[PDB]
Design a protein around this nucleic acid. Structure first.
Lengths: 156, 197, 106, 183, 127
RNA sequence: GAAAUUGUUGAAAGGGAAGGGCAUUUGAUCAGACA
RNA sequence: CCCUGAAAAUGGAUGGCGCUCAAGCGUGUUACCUAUACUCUACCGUCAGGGUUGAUAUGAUGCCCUGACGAGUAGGCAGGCGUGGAGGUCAGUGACGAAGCCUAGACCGUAAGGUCGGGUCGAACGGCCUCUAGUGCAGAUCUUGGUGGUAGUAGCAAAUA
RNA sequence: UUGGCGGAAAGGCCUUGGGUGCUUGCUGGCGAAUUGCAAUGUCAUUUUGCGUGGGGAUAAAUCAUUUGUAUACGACUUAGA
């Protein structure tokens, strides 16, 4: 003793953390998003797939499905900020909704519990869908940025 | 805003049309000026030929070669002054100069194909009326450009093998008009002009 | 359809630079179309991605990305500024550029 | 022993040192490079054609203010000479090795030169008379010769990699759509 | 196996070469505050090298830390090893280069009976 | 058995020098971290 | 404001291209770009003020809290880094490989420099407290020794062969 | 596949007569999920190499030798079953 040795040998204590002041509050969304809206999913497996906003979850998430009969769009979580909320509006008068939460999507192929909930929810949507015109079609078709397209304009 | 871009020099202003195309460039905008022999410039014909006159004497003493080459050929010219504004002597340069072609008269792979203008660089909106101006056409001649009349023949041509493209694109589009009012009062066409259209 | 694109087309012009000293950290955006500082205001915050192609495949792809975003109006034109995780590479002055539409607000 | 950086199987190989050779280094460089990569039996026929202004040793590195020829033309070069003394050595070793290859029991139609190197060997001091009683040097550059003659072989084959795949959960469940759909 | 420190920021990762080093074969890359009256590096002009100065030190917290976050320590023999015993999260070991192979595996072994990480366990491995 | 300085080999670059700085990209190469 | 007046020697210079209801001249309005400057925060250092002996964990020349400052030739001071040998110490490393040398392998320090992976090698040598010096090199048309590009070049041609 | 146009870099443009798909012109019915809340989520077009398989063709040049309309040497110019 290549090397000597210090006098000071640090502490091996690990600290506690300071009492802190950050309370989690409830997300205030942008105002366009009302249950009954078509969205446009800007990313993911379904980038561009026009979809229907059903419920606001607690994890801030959006519970949406297209009508699975339409368009391939199951009941699914989706993030506010990867989504364009448009004008159009179904009514979403008749949908259960209240069974859906954060525990329902717990990655704890397919489930038939989840398959049945798709049919029930869709039959109430499809009904308020067949109200308007060509809407069934607008939900099927994928949205896109054509030639001379200007989002900025393009009032969604 | 496209992959290519076919400008027609005519009614231009070397000078200005000049830039824009160098700017562009440095921003990935393959461009292809044509026609040119019909460029244009501020100033009474005379000059410029005076102007020209110099960038001519400027040589290299000791070997007239290896020195500043004085092209004649409208093309080349435009070029140059284009150029001057694109830092060549680097790579980004060059990678610039490629993007740009140039011919006097619209040859083929363009006579097709559409072309455009560059307003902000049109005589006819820069100048004030009364001021004399040029025509790279003459200029080039005059400082020796064997070929102006061989262009000016292949012009007489294609101003036709065009027109007769025309009086044919136009007797078409017109029937489409006398066969486009039969079907439109149709149902489809009133909802339409409510959304617009 | 034939179109898929649910990005805005647009180009890598520059470094911020003074007449003779440049700053690789900031980059400049030619959003194809956008002509004013307003038109740019829309694309602050929206993400970017110089995509390109290496020869030797990683990671399972031939294709790579650098994740912008757009951060402010640059002067009159709705050129805009545009930190990226990594600084764009210069060879890129004139390369195509995917402004996206997320961190959305519509 | 201990040659230069070889790069071949010594079991199918034969080697040979001259060494402290008094033949010029800048010249021998040039003959050795000219023969390098050869089929041994051709090489010797090539060097015999040289002597003999039939065909030349093309000077590449140590070639300045050499004069030119039509012999070229063959090697994409203007500047080339016939350095007998260099060759004589180089074919005095090529002789050495094809006998050194025959006590290992190598096929003489394959051998080929694989690695041949020449070096500045140490000088040979001498002196000269310059104007005004000035003595200069007047040094003979000598050479360390050495060629590794070898049985040629074929291709390799390839073999590597094992291109291990480390990719994502997002990436799996794209590939999945793929063979589920089509294949 | 760390003590939850900050981030280890280094400042100037690159070596500080000496002006000229490249150009000369005589002038080492070892650093040399230039004293030249003409010098471009002294008068720091743009557009040359930076010279080393304070400035660049590295946070007192993370000084002398591998990246792991341990400070290394020279261990010639096994007595030596037995001062680190307590401070496994803060310190580490590095066996000296001028150890026999038989006395390495011993230290190696003695390491792990007590949790301690060494930064050259490769050493001189008969492999 | 050092360097200058040479010779194979291997990798790379090169339109009137080379080299150096900040910055990324690609190519080669490597540390630790994860439990 | 234009013009004449207005003539110098390589080719050529509002920096260049080029520019003509300007990209000229005069003036006015905004927006905009950008220095190591200014504002804010982090980190380094120095300097100034402060707080902390209660034993009892590790340094009281220690551990903290607050602030303001940081360009430098000549020049002064300070804290370090390294080298030869000397007293002390670690019952230190070592033929199971010390010293040296090569290493676009790693780690540490702002740095001087340290440590280590691999190869080479064959007999001695490091940390630490301290003493001591013939102690640190790029330059002196420095010394001594070596070796280049020049360059397979100049050239080896007087005295009949 | 019929017939035409075009040479300024044509290397493209138009047109007949068929063979056959898809047709969102209007109406339907199945499938799409777990790519787990985004990660370009890879579908372009560069040039080259190695073999299977459908048609085609079956040469020069350089050295050495030689000439002197040529020539410092290379180059040039001729000659040669």
């Amino acid at each position: 003793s290549a090397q000597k040795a210090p006098k000071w040998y640090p502490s091996e204590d690990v600290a506690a953390l300071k009492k802190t002041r950050k309370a989690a509050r409830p997300q205030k969304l942008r105002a366009s998003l009302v249950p009954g809206t078509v969205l446009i999913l800007l990313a993911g497996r379904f980038r561009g797939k026009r979809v229907v906003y059903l419920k606001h979850l607690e994890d801030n998430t959006l519970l949406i499905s297209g009508p699975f009969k339409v368009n391939g769009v199951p009941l699914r979580r989706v993030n506010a900020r990867y989504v364009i909320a448009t004008s159009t509006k179904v009514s979403v008068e008749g949908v259960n909704v209240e069974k859906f939460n954060v525990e329902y999507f717990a990655k704890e192929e397919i489930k038939a519990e989840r398959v049945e909930d798709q049919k029930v929810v869709d039959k109430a949507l499809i009904a308020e869908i067949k109200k308007t015109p060509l809407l069934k079609q607008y939900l099927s078709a994928s949205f896109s940025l054509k030639n001379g397209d200007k989002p900025h304009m393009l009032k969604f | 805003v496209e992959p290519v871009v076919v400008i027609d020099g005519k009614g231009h202003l070397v000078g200005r049309l000049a830039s824009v195309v160098a700017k562009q460039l440095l921003n990935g905008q393959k461009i292809v000026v044509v026609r040119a022999e019909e460029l244009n410039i501020s100033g009474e014909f005379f000059r410029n030929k005076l102007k020209y006159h110099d960038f001519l004497r400027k040589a290299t003493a000791f070997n007239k070669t290896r020195g500043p080459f004085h092209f004649r050929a409208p093309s080349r010219i435009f070029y140059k002054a284009l150029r001057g504004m694109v830092s060549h002597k680097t790579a980004r340069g060059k990678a610039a100069l490629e993007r740009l072609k140039v011919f006097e008269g619209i040859p083929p792979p363009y006579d097709k194909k559409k072309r455009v203008v560059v307003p902000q660089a049109l005589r006819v909106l820069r100048l004030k009326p009364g001021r004399k101006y040029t025509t790279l056409g003459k200029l080039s001649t005059s400082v020796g450009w064997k070929y102006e009349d061989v262009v000016a023949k292949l012009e007489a041509k294609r101003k036709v093998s065009s027109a007769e493209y025309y009086a044919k694109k136009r007797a078409f589009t017109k029937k489409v008009a006398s066969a486009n009012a039969t079907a439109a009062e149709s149902d489809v066409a009133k909802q339409l002009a409510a959304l617009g259209y | 359809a034939e179109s898929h694109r649910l990005y805005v087309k647009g180009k890598h012009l520059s470094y911020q630079r003074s007449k003779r000293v440049n700053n690789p950290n900031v980059s400049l955006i030619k959003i194809e179309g956008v002509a004013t500082p307003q038109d740019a205001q829309f694309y602050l915050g929206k993400r970017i991605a110089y995509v390109y192609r290496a020869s030797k495949e990683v990671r399972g792809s031939k294709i790579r990305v650098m994740w912008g975003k757009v951060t402010r109006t640059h002067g009159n034109s709705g050129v805009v500024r545009a930190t990226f995780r990594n600084n764009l590479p210069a060879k890129t002055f004139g390369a195509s550029v995917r402004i996206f539409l997320y961190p959305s607000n519509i | 022993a201990r040659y230069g950086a070889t790069s071949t199987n010594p079991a199918k190989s034969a080697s040979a040192r001259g060494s402290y050779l008094r033949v010029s280094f800048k010249n021998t460089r040039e003959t050795a490079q000219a023969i390098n990569g050869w089929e041994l039996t051709k090489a010797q026929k090539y060097l015999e054609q040289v002597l003999d202004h039939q065909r030349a040793i093309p000077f590449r590195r140590f070639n300045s203010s050499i004069g030119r020829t039509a012999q070229g033309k063959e090697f994409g070069v203007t500047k080339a000479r016939w350095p007998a003394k260099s060759v004589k050595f180089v074919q005095g070793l090529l002789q050495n090795a094809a006998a050194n290859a025959e006590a290992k029991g190598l096929d003489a139609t394959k051998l080929y030169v694989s690695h041949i190197q020449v070096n500045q060997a140490p000088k040979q001091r001498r002196r000269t008379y310059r104007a005004h009683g000035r003595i200069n040097k007047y040094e003979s550059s000598p050479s360390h010769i050495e060629l590794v003659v070898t049985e040629k072989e074929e291709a390799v084959a390839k073999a590597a990699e094992k291109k291990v795949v480390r990719l994502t959960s997002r990436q799996r469940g794209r590939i999945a759509a793929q063979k589920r759909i089509a294949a | 196996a760390s003590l939850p420190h900050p981030k280890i920021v280094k400042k100037h990762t690159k070596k500080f070469k000496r002006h000229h080093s490249d150009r000369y074969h005589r002038v080492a890359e070892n650093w040399r505050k230039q004293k030249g009256i003409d010098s471009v590096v002294r008068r720091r002009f743009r557009g040359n090298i930076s010279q080393p100065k304070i400035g660049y030190g590295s946070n007192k917290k993370t000084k002398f830390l591998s990246p792991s976050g341990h400070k290394t320590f020279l261990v010639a023999n096994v007595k030596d090893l037995e001062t680190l015993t307590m401070h496994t999260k803060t310190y580490a070991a590095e066996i000296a280069h001028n150890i026999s192979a038989k006395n390495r595996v011993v230290i190696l072994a003695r390491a792990k009976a007590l949790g301690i990480k060494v930064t050259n366990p490769k050493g001189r491995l008969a492999l």
